Design an enzyme around this catalytic site. Sequence first.
Site, PDB file in Angstrom:
ATOM      1  N   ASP A  77      87.902 -29.100 -37.206  1.00 30.27           N
ATOM      2  CA  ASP A  77      86.819 -29.021 -37.719  1.00 30.27           C
ATOM      3  C   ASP A  77      86.677 -27.474 -38.246  1.00 30.27           C
ATOM      4  OD1 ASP A  77      85.575 -31.173 -36.351  1.00 30.27           O
ATOM      5  OD2 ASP A  77      85.981 -30.215 -34.457  1.00 30.27           O
ATOM      6  N   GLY A  78      87.436 -27.188 -39.234  1.00 32.23           N
ATOM      7  CA  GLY A  78      87.362 -25.986 -39.829  1.00 32.23           C
ATOM      8  C   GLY A  78      88.712 -25.274 -39.653  1.00 32.23           C
ATOM      9  N   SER A  91      83.973 -22.984 -40.753  1.00 32.72           N
ATOM     10  CA  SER A  91      83.659 -23.566 -39.386  1.00 32.72           C
ATOM     11  C   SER A  91      82.664 -24.664 -40.033  1.00 32.72           C
ATOM     12  CB  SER A  91      83.144 -22.824 -38.555  1.00 32.72           C
ATOM     13  OG  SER A  91      82.781 -23.455 -37.560  1.00 32.72           O
ATOM     14  N   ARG A  92      83.197 -25.836 -39.483  1.00 33.95           N
ATOM     15  CA  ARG A  92      82.226 -26.985 -39.728  1.00 33.95           C
ATOM     16  C   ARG A  92      81.324 -27.268 -38.884  1.00 33.95           C
ATOM     17  NH1 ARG A  92      86.072 -30.478 -43.455  1.00 33.95           N
ATOM     18  NH2 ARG A  92      88.037 -29.459 -42.958  1.00 33.95           N
ATOM     19  N   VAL A  93      81.017 -26.656 -37.572  1.00 32.97           N
ATOM     20  CA  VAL A  93      79.959 -26.701 -36.867  1.00 32.97           C
ATOM     21  C   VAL A  93      79.056 -25.729 -37.193  1.00 32.97           C
ATOM     22  CG1 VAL A  93      79.211 -26.090 -34.645  1.00 32.97           C
ATOM     23  CG2 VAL A  93      81.483 -27.166 -35.018  1.00 32.97           C
TER      24      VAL A  93
END
Lengths: 100, 118, 118, 114, 60, 49, 249, 222, 100, 35, 118
Positions: free
Chosen positions: I1-2, I26-28
């Site tokens: 997630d990144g 960051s994918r969050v």
Amino acid sequence: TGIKAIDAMTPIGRGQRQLIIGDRKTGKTAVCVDTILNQREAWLTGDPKQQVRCVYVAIGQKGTTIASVKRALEEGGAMEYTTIVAAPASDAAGFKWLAP
Amino acid sequence: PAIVGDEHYRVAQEVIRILQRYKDLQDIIAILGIDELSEEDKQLVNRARRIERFLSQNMMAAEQFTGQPGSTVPLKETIEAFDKLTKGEFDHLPEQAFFLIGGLDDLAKKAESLGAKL
Amino acid sequence: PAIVGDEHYRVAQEVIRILQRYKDLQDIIAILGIDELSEEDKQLVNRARRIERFLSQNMMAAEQFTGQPGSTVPLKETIEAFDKLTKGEFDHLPEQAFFLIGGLDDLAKKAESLGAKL
Amino acid sequence: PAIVGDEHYRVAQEVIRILQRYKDLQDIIAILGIDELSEEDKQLVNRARRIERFLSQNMMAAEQFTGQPGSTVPLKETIEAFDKLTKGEFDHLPEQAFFLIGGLDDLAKKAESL
Amino acid sequence: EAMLAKTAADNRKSAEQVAAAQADYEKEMAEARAQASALRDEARAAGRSVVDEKRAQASG
Amino acid sequence: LADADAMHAKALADAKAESEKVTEEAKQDSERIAAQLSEQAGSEAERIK
Amino acid sequence: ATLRELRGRIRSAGSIKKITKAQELIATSRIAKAQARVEAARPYAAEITNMLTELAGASALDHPLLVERKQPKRAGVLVVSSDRGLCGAYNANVLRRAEELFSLLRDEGKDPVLYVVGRKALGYFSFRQRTVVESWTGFSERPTYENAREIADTLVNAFMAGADDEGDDAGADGILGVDELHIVFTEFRSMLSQTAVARRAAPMEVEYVGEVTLYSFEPDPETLFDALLPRYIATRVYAALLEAAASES
Amino acid sequence: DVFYLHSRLLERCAKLSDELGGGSMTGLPIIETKANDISAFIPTNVISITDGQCFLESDLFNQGVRPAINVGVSVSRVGGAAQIKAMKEVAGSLRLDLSQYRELEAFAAFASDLDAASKAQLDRGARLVELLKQPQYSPLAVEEQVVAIFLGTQGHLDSVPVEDVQRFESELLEHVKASHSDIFDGIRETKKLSEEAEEKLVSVINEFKKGFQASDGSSVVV
Amino acid sequence: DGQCFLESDLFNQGVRPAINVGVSVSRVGGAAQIKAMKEVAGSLRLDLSQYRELEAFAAFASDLDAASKAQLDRGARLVELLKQPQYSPLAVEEQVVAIF
Amino acid sequence: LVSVINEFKKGFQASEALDPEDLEKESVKVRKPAP
Amino acid sequence: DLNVEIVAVERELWSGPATFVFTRTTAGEIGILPRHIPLVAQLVDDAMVRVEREGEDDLRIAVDGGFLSVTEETVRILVENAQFESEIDADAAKEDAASDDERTAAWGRARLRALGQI
Ligand SMILES: Nc1ncnc2c1ncn2[C@@H]1O[C@H](COP(=O)(O)OP(=O)(O)OP(=O)(O)O)[C@@H](O)[C@H]1O
Ligand SMILES: [Mg+2]
């Protein structure tokens, strides 16, 4: 071919093999379709020494692309003297290998 | 810093930063020399050339190749010398004065031999 | 031209040509600087930078990342805005005004926020 | 020199030097024209043009195209002719006189014909 | 003195008037050619509109 | 002065003459273009059908 | 990925090659033009030098511009540089020459006063924190006589304002002038050789040559000499500017 | 035997002798390169097999050069033998003109610094580059191509602005076909451009230039 | 997630941690931050990406405009702000104030 | 916070030579001999 | 006949035979004929030079920064700047004249005098 660049700088004679080589979306199919369309007047002449019969072999293209090419040939009246041999992407490797 | 001390670490980091900037500028320099760089970059490049030459040394085991006896530099003298060199205190000395020598005393003698004065 | 129309195709081709020329000039700008370009090339570089920024957009799905609400631009507004860009009608605005916005209204607002005005 | 002798080597090297210098000046000539060239540069350009045109020859296989028969220049004749050309003993003759000829006799005849 | 001043101003007037006449002639030529080009372009545009509405009708 | 004024008048007369000539030619060319385009559009309609 | 990077670098290098070669040929043409300008300027300089020689012979050599100021303390240094930066070490050479001149002046006991032509020297001294009294820019490649005349007027006015200067006070002038004038510029000896040189322009000294119908001067030799000497200074400044332009190209 | 695959496929395209009816088959194989790497295995093989190559490039395409043929590297080993006499005449200078143009294009902004010959070469090259541009699905008859190339290579586009060349060309071709179709007839039937036809074409071009109007509005006459 | 891309070039030139902002992500996103941090650092990553772009592009601009100088100065200050020595954690509130 | 920042900012403290002959001398020529 | 030479600081403007040379030195109006004695004078701030040749009309020139030097061989006129009668325009000769600036007004007056209307 009816294309000034080709007909002036890299002329093609009858019996020649002229490769059209390039990256994707550079106009290779456009050039070939323009050549086939240009043969329309020669076809209408009616004289076999001037007429050019066209074969378009489509290997590994999606069926809708082949349909688009056929539509373009219809618009210009080229299908009266053009045959399409189609081995679309869904065909077996045997057909893709044999179509040419 | 926790092991070698703050001064040693600071001098080492400054030397590395100057050399890294010189490496980054290599691309421009290879084509155009140093004359197209800003004044800060020109100063930094001269400093980096002097630093990279001064990192060389006349080694004990190199005598058999050159006949030149080797030298040993104490760590404190090394830290002081490279601190001064990063500060620009030797910008006036010619580059060759820094080549294959020991500590600051050797630098002074070699610069004198070349006509320059420290 | 047959499907999207003459104006859409024209504006798209002009945008692509400008961006291709900018891509060609990138290396020259990086090494020799922008001052060594011809006047038309400098104007084109400014236009291309503004165009590449304006192709950026704040998307709704990106609000979780930028914390900025998204925008939707009608096609006709897009065509008109990029036609104005390719003609240099927005060369007086800072390029930062074109970053992550919607249409020409958002462009005017951001230019006002940055001290410019169209 | 160990294979073809010193005279041949010297003449060939001089011809190569002159042609290389002319090639270097070609870009200047193309961009700014021959006016910007120095007087020595102009002299060298003329000499190099004559040399590069004397390297042409009326070939045997070219007879069927241009009816003229081909020529066979002896090696010593070529060496001496190009030595003279490099030294600057034909720069007065017109350029056209150097197209597609054999040795020095043909050069003299074509110069007379002009 | 008045005759001399006349002669001078009259020569100047003729010298500028020949040029002014040539400029006016060129200006009207350019204006007429621009009008002709506009006529041609408008005819082409109207024809394009005709073929476009023909396309729309045929598609429907 | 008399010559210049007369020449200016004659030049303006030629200006008119040629302006009307070119405008007439432009009208004829516009009519030809319209007819040609209409014929082509008719052929295209035949093809669409 | 490595091959893609290498191909990109090759494309970049090819573009840089093309641009630099074009600039090199353009510089060739510019050199021809600058040399033509220098040759065109020569005759006026030579003949005005002859006239100044005649007037100096037939006049009292007491002009303030010719008399050496006792215990000088200021020097007006004019550093001629370029606006464009792709000239190699030209600016660096000029600035090293100027710095050496400054050291010599400090040894002689004079505080240099800085005048700059060209943006590159401006940047150099801005980084060095050396204040520039006044600077000119924008005409390094093709200077005209107007620019040289303006520079000469400024320098000569500063020199005159220095006559009444004592210690640090400006004197009755109200301006703290300079007791000496120097020009640092690149002489164009030939295509291969272009050397930075510093030459003092004021106070001009006198060297006597042994010997060769005399001349008649209107109104008198003194006024003609006074009115001509500043013109000579402007002529020398213009010649130096043209030489600098040729050497820069 | 992949090379053998393509070679045996493409050697069946031939020009038969008169003993066998004189028929012929022309091949137009298409090859997709990746990152314009013509030294890959299959591009290498097919380039070796064929008689000539038309190299299409994305950079030229994005520059507006369409069809995006790189005339610098595109070759036809058959060459002039495959052209009619008229095209051979008009197209003789194109190669050198375009090569000189590509040599000089680095000096585009410095036309003042260029002697007259070089600036003329640069302008002619720009005109010719515009001339070779063609819209899609618009093949040109050989006579029309000859007339257009004649316009380009005979200095009849020099007075035209670069950005107008295309339109001019097209319009002029439509003019001739509408009023002076005898030129096209002559060229097609004889396959050469006669002196009388050339003079008539020059006069027609000049009259049309009189009638033409540039995008910027300036006249294109003389 | 990144990912966080660490580069030796940035490390050597003093940027520690040597996080390459242009490619690190960051994918969050904002969901993984407290409201204050999300508020004071919404466009920080994009701002530094654009700053690095401009810095590379303006490496020889003899005469920049006011907006470009402002962006360069702000970016340099932000880059200095993000520097951090080893074993020197900040509480989230301190980070919020610093980014403020 | 901004007030504290501004107060702190008020408190914050932010930290050879030529051979004289090489200098060529412009001079005025006098056809007369030395004095 | 005597050789006149109007030479500017940048480019020699004119040179050739003449039969008479009229101008206005600071002392007063001066006329020079072939074998005039050697002389060196300063032209007036708004001087004008009239060169009378043989078989051609008088050549009238406006001069800024003038200096006349008559020698046994030739006559020379030195100008900071100079404009011929053809290259002078009455309007700017008028607005330039009557201006506050001393040099501007002098240049305007010299141009007017060269024109003839004074
Ligand atoms: N001469 C032209 N003028 C304008 N557009 C053109 C021209 N030739 C081709 N195009 C457009 O370029 C795009 C690519 O054309 P085309 O699909 O024929 O190329 P290709 O190289 O065969 O592509 P692909 O890799 O998809 O098979 C299409 O949009 C086509 O319409
Ligand atoms: Mg395709």
